[PDB]
From Swiss-Prot, chain B:
Functional summary from the UniProt entry: Cytoplasmic dynein 1 acts as a motor for the intracellular retrograde motility of vesicles and organelles along microtubules. Dynein has ATPase activity; the force-producing power stroke is thought to occur on release of ADP. Plays a role in mitotic spindle assembly and metaphase plate congression.
Official protein name in the record: Cytoplasmic dynein 1 heavy chain 1
Subunit structure as annotated in this protein's UniProt entry: Homodimer. The cytoplasmic dynein 1 complex consists of two catalytic heavy chains (HCs) and a number of non-catalytic subunits presented by intermediate chains (ICs), light intermediate chains (LICs) and light chains (LCs); the composition seems to vary in respect to the IC, LIC and LC composition. The heavy chain homodimer serves as a scaffold for the probable homodimeric assembly of the respective non-catalytic subunits. The ICs and LICs bind directly to the HC dimer and dynein LCs assemble on the IC dimer. Interacts with DYNC1LI1; DYNC1LI1 and DYNC1LI2 bind mutually exclusive to DYNC1H1.
Assigned protein family: Belongs to the dynein heavy chain family.
Disulfide bonds, paired cysteine numbers: none
Whole-protein residues included: 921 to 968 of 4646
Location relative to the cell: Cytoplasm, Cytoskeleton
Illness: Charcot-Marie-Tooth disease, axonal, type 2O: An axonal form of Charcot-Marie-Tooth disease, a disorder of the peripheral nervous system, characterized by progressive weakness and atrophy, initially of the peroneal muscles and later of the distal muscles of the arms. Charcot-Marie-Tooth disease is classified in two main groups on the basis of electrophysiologic properties and histopathology: primary peripheral demyelinating neuropathies (designated CMT1 when they are dominantly inherited) and primary peripheral axonal neuropathies (CMT2).
Swiss-Prot/TrEMBL domain comment: Dynein heavy chains probably consist of an N-terminal stem (which binds cargo and interacts with other dynein components), and the head or motor domain. The motor contains six tandemly-linked AAA domains in the head, which form a ring. A stalk-like structure (formed by two of the coiled coil domains) protrudes between AAA 4 and AAA 5 and terminates in a microtubule-binding site. A seventh domain may also contribute to this ring; it is not clear whether the N-terminus or the C-terminus forms this extra domain.
Length: 49, 23
C-alpha cells in the first residue's frame, strides 16, 4: 500500500520502478551460487530460492 | 566405426536445461 500510494497514477501506474526492478534482478537469478571475491566467498545458497 | 560408436575416441558433448525469469 505504501508503494501504491507513493506512485498512484505514475507515467501510467509505475512505469519506472517496474523497470528498475528488472535490473535489480541482478546479483540473483543466475547460475552462480556463491560469489567469490579474492579469498572471500559469500555464498547465497540458502536464500537462492 | 565412428558411426557405430555414435549409434574411435569420441568427445562427450553435454548441455544443460536452466530457467531464467521463469522460462
Amino acid at each position: 500500500e505504501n508503494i501504491y500510494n507513493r506512485l498512484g497514477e505514475d507515467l501510467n501506474k509505475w512505469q519506472a520502478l517496474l523497470v528498475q526492478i528488472r535490473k535489480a534482478r541482478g546479483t540473483f537469478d543466475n547460475a552462480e551460487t556463491k560469489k567469490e571475491f579474492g579469498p572471500v566467498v559469500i555464498d547465497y545458497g540458502k536464500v537462492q530460492s | 566405426a565412428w558411426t557405430q560408436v555414435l549409434l574411435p575416441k569420441i568427445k562427450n558433448v553435454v548441455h544443460e536445461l536452466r530457467i531464467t525469469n521463469q522460462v
